[PDB]
Amino acid sequence: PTPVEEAQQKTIEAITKAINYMAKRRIGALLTIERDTGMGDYIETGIPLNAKVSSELLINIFIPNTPLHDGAVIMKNNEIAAAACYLPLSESPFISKELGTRHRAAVGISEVTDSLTIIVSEETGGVSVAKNGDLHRELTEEALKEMLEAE
Amino acid sequence: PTPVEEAQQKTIEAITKAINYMAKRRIGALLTIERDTGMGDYIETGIPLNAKVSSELLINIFIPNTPLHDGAVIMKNNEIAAAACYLPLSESPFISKELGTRHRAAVGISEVTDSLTIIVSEETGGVSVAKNGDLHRELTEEALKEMLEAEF
Ligand SMILES: COc1ccnc(NN)n1
Ligand SMILES: [Mg+2]
DSSP, X not given: OOHHHHHHHHHHHHHHHHHHHHHHHTOOEEEEEOOSSOOHHHHTTSEEEEEEOXXXXXXXXXXXXXXXXXXXXXXXXXXXXXXXXXXXXXXXXXXXXXOOHHHHHHHHHHHHSSOEEEEEOTTTOOEEEEETXXXXXXOOHHHHXXXXXXX | OOHHHHHHHHHHHHHHHHHHHHHHHTOOEEEEEOOSSOOHHHHTTSEEEEEEOOHHHHHHHTOTTSTTSSSEEEXXXXXXXXXXXXXXXXXXXXXXXXXXXXHHHHXXXXXXXXXXXXXXXXXXXXXXXXXXXXXXXXXXXXXXXXXXXXXX
């Protein structure tokens, strides 16, 4: 593997470790990975970080009742660009009616960008991914890894 | 003021806001500001962040029972270089006997660098600074801000 490929794999590993920790503890989380569609306007609504990715930093960001947990982390160029960012809420009538604004925000950004967003539910610890306007629910760890590698 | 001066003032405002929040809630914290003596050897022992400073990130780092809360945050100019860093423990007899590892680590790094370290006690909420081998305890918010402004 090249240094770029090793860097992507290390980032995937950091993401999945953090997601698993939060799912176990039913900590709500919202993590959007910018792709070809720029999301600077949304990044600018949050707290700037421009931080190296680590599972530890991701977990510390989403701790309940802390400054940085309310909103979305947005990742760009293999770094955490900002935390506590605003995402647009989807008006789609085809999202499961039991879900709240976290999932609607993930679907909403997925409607107007090619980004991939990961959501951890605070009600169940379930893990889902929003892309292209659809929400993929009740993912296993292997399913999430496959989506991150495919992306 | 120059951009460098404005950035310094922003970083001091972020630090003081974080320390004040943590002091009020008895959140233990250990925050070393690198000066002219390079601290790379200690930065390398922690989790790399290389992150822009904010009061919100500093507070989130030290929340008890989280991955990044144990060990020192080391700041380099206007960045949080790393968290959960090791610092050497001082054996100075002028550290109050009731104080724990955070204060001893702060004095310890202050004996081998020109850095300024801020400590929040999880027992009392009191704020102290370690510099040049000396620990100064029970600082007011004004005293801390003045110390930080004088450092730059
Ligand atoms: C890290 O990926 C995932 C997905 C679904 N559940 C979990 N852990 N309970 N991890
Ligand atoms: Mg006194």
